Ligand SMILES: *[C@@H]1O[C@H](CO[C@@H]2O[C@@H](C)[C@@H](O)[C@@H](O)[C@@H]2O)[C@@H](O[C@@H]2O[C@H](CO)[C@@H](O[C@@H]3O[C@H](CO[C@H]4O[C@H](CO)[C@@H](O)[C@H](O)[C@@H]4O[C@@H]4O[C@H](CO)[C@@H](O)[C@H](O)[C@H]4NC(C)=O)[C@@H](O)[C@H](O[C@H]4O[C@H](CO)[C@@H](O)[C@H](O)[C@@H]4O[C@@H]4O[C@H](CO)[C@@H](O[C@@H]5O[C@H](CO)[C@H](O)[C@H](O)[C@H]5O)[C@H](O)[C@H]4NC(C)=O)[C@@H]3O)[C@H](O)[C@H]2NC(C)=O)[C@H](O)[C@H]1NC(C)=O
Ligand SMILES: *[C@@H]1O[C@H](CO[C@@H]2O[C@@H](C)[C@@H](O)[C@@H](O)[C@@H]2O)[C@@H](O[C@@H]2O[C@H](CO)[C@@H](O[C@@H]3O[C@H](CO[C@H]4O[C@H](CO)[C@@H](O)[C@H](O)[C@@H]4O[C@@H]4O[C@H](CO)[C@@H](O)[C@H](O)[C@H]4NC(C)=O)[C@@H](O)[C@H](O[C@H]4O[C@H](CO)[C@@H](O)[C@H](O)[C@@H]4O[C@@H]4O[C@H](CO)[C@@H](O[C@@H]5O[C@H](CO)[C@H](O)[C@H](O)[C@H]5O)[C@H](O)[C@H]4NC(C)=O)[C@@H]3O)[C@H](O)[C@H]2NC(C)=O)[C@H](O)[C@H]1NC(C)=O
Ligand SMILES: [Ca+2]
Ligand SMILES: [Ca+2]
């Protein structure tokens with residue numbers, strides 16, 4: 001089992017509320033811990049007028065620029081702008097997008113492109129298996145508290 | 160008996176032909192030797208389109224500025240411009256216009272206002288009864304020759 | 319009778335018979351005032367000044383205007399700020415931006431302006447809008463807080479055929495905005 | 500359809516909807532081009548540029564003009580120089596004075612000018628006027644020596660009601676000068 | 681649908697004899713596109 | 727009396743798309759007064 005968490009770097013601060021404007025790291029369309037869940041607790045700040053406006057479109061402006069694999073870089077040229085995918089793999093869903101899926105999306109946080117990365121409360125640790133760096137990251141908890149990765153049991157968005 | 164003559168000063172020269180532009184001294188409306196005769200041998204250069212344009216009007220432009228006693232200074236403000244008549248006697252026909260009639264008109268030539276003065280071939284002499292000045296004046300003759308006052312018998316316009 | 323009349327159908331890329339000030343320019347056969355961004359002023363006003371009244375005989379003018387404009391916003395929940403047809407002194411230039419539609423400068427009446435305009439506002443302003451939010455049409459005159467404002471539906475993105483004609487004899491202007499249906 | 504139209508009756512002392520260049524100004528309810536003197540240029544051309552054709556669709560325009568002008572000279576035997584209605588590039592200014600009516604500069608065709616005009620000349624010019632003196636009307640186009648000139652009576656001082664309308668479909672202009680009778 | 685307004689406005693009293701007429705829109709800390717597709721205007725003074 | 731002229735003038739070929747129209751007179755080593763009393767002008771492009 002694994003919960004949902006909002007993973008951030010370290011160097012200045014803010015909270016889930018202040019999100020608007022920032023650059024996000026995603027795993028891919030509808031990938032739960034990198035979208036489904038995030039979009040849930042963000043929806044209120046989206047001002048999304050429902051259909052037929054794509055709920056993606058709403059989050060397409062709210063976030064200054066990001067990487068959401070499988071995103072129409074032709075209509076929403078911004079859900080892909082941060083995508084490390086040099087080539088036709090830009091914003092790709094395949095593995096040719098170094099920031100595709102969990103680790104990649106988290107690695108999007110590592111190279112200072114994104115500020116918040118929605119990747120499972122397991123990745124980051126598994127990823128940065130080095131003591132210091134493990135201490136060099138924060139985690140946004142639903143109650144707008146920036147609790148540490150180790151505290152994910154509490155600092156988790158949805159179950 | 161007395162003929163008609165065109166009396167001029169001295170200091171540079173020209174001839175009856177070159178008249179256009181100059182400032183004239185007259186005796187008064189229809190006064191023969193100061194108008195009737197002059198207007199006769201000038202008519203050709205007047206471009207006077209006949210009636211109802213006043214033949215005065217034609218000569219009103221041809222001469223840069225003059226003194227013609229009895230001239231409508233309201234419609235032809237130029238047949239009077241040289242008139243020495245300080246006051247309501249400006250361009251007057253009375254004797255209140257120092258340049259009215261023969262001597263006056265000639266005296267218009269004396270104070271360098273006019274360049275040609277149509278005054279009888281008797282006036283000038285009678286007027287300037289001093290040897291030198293008598294020599295200081297010229298006379299336009301019909302055959303475009305600037306013959307001296309003493310030669311008026313020849314240098315006369317009409318009889 | 320003094321009479322000036324012009325009818326523009328396709329605002330070509332060169333468009334000489336107008337004056338563009340601030341941003342505003344022609345585009346795909348259309349005059350553009352603001353390119354859907356943050357904090358920009360747009361206004362275009364025909365080149366020949368027209369004379370409305372006669373001081374020589376205190377006679378006011380009759381005038382009609384018809385135009386199909388469009389306000390298409392990226393989000394139907396965050397429009398701004400407004401579109402307005404103004405009449406003002408020949409030597410006129412972009413006044414305060416933001417929610418003043420670039421023609422006025424004070425909520426309060428400032429006689430000096432000498433500007434009567436019809437405004438189609440799309441962003442409520444507590445300080446001077448009918449407290450109920452409602453987007454609306456209004457008739458401005460030296461203020462910003464109109465003398466009359468009637469609430470109206472945006473139809474974000476649809477063409478809109480409007481027309482306004484004042485009455486010289488009756489000193490009465492009428493504005494009608496009709497969304498094709 | 501693009502359409503501009505203006506009708507001026509009393510050229511007031513202020514007169515904004517025009518451009519006066521050289522001398523020319525308004526006066527007693529009238530536009531004056533030259534004040535009956537020696538060597539002066541006068542021209543006034545309405546402020547809004549009009550577009551005649553369409554490069555986008557090689558379509559020429561239909562246009563009509565009507566006006567009552569007057570040439571009153573002090574002497575009916577020494578008139579000069581001329582009055583002309585010209586059409587020229589927006590950025591246009593007084594060209595050679597004298598007998599060029601301030602619109603052209605060479606007797607010879609100079610394509611560059613881009614000026615077609617109707618001229619009412621009142622002073623024969625050996626170098627380029629129909630050798631018979633005769634004052635006349637003419638249709639100028641990049642020269643001064645028209646392509647057509649028809650002799651006519653001055654009526655020095657009388658009002659004259661003229662009107663000229665070109666044909667877009669037929670590319671034909673017609674000028675008629677009528678002295679009220 | 682149509683939306684209309686009528687109001688007695690003593691023009692003479694408010695705006696000069698000579699006036700230029702124009703279109704003007706703006707955008708603040710929010711926005712939208714403003715575009716004009718056509719234009720008519722005929723004014724006669726007696 | 728009336729005096730008239732008709733001549734086929736291919737306008738498009740000679741003067742620009744955008745043109746200002748005007749009145750202009752002059753005076754040389756001779757003169758006369760030139761004055762305009764009214765003016766009309768309606769131009770439609772298809
Ligand atoms: C998601 O949706 C929500 C909700 O949307 C709203 O509701 C829907 C139904 C729609 O109607 C929609 O239109 C609504 O917004 C969005 O949240 C809302 O977002 C808007 C847009 O930003 C906010 O509105 C802004 O409010 C700003 C702050 O207002 C306060 O401060 C003002 C003075 O600074 C004061 O005038 C206000 O009254 C207010 O002050 C107090 O506020 C409290 C609490 O609200 C009240 O209780 C008090 O009553 C009130 N007054 C007092 C005396 O207490 C405004 O600054 C901002 O105005 C600017 O934009 C609007 C047009 O959009 C113009 O009308 C203004 O003229 C102005 O334009 C220009 O704005 C820029 C930016 O400020 C200025 O430039 C900068 O100014 C700086 C100032 O220091 C610097 O000087 C800098 O150098 C300079 O460049 C220009 O100068 C300025 N021009 C002029 C001429 O002024 C605007 O009105 C809503 O407040 C906000 N809702 C809430 C509850 O906060 C959300 O954004 C939306 N999007 C997303 C992505 O989620
Ligand atoms: C009384 O009536 C008579 C008769 O009237 C005539 O007939 C009636 C029916 C009417 O039609 C009426 O219109 C007629 O005039 C009046 O006498 C006549 O008066 C006029 C007006 O002055 C004279 O016409 C002038 O001729 C001048 C000289 O022409 C000769 O020289 C020219 C070059 O300099 C040349 O182009 C001419 O062709 C001619 O040269 C040769 O002449 C011989 C003998 O005639 C011929 O056999 C040859 O064929 C001929 N060519 C050759 C190659 O041999 C012109 O200068 C003068 O032109 C100016 O005015 C007219 C409009 O009035 C414009 O069309 C011109 O553009 C020009 O305008 C501007 O004029 C001024 C003044 O010159 C210039 O400014 C000055 O120029 C100076 C030059 O050095 C300086 O540079 C100075 O700094 C500068 O300020 C401007 O630059 C100039 N602008 C331009 C663009 O050029 C005009 O055409 C008649 O010739 C004369 N009749 C006779 C037989 O002489 C009489 O005046 C009238 N009034 C009174 C009160 O009695
Ligand atoms: Ca507003
Ligand atoms: Ca000529």
Ligand SMILES: [Mn+2]
Nearest residue numbers: 439447456462
């Ligand atoms: Mn309002």
Ligand SMILES: [Mn+2]
Nearest residue numbers: 620628637643
């Ligand atoms: Mn000619």
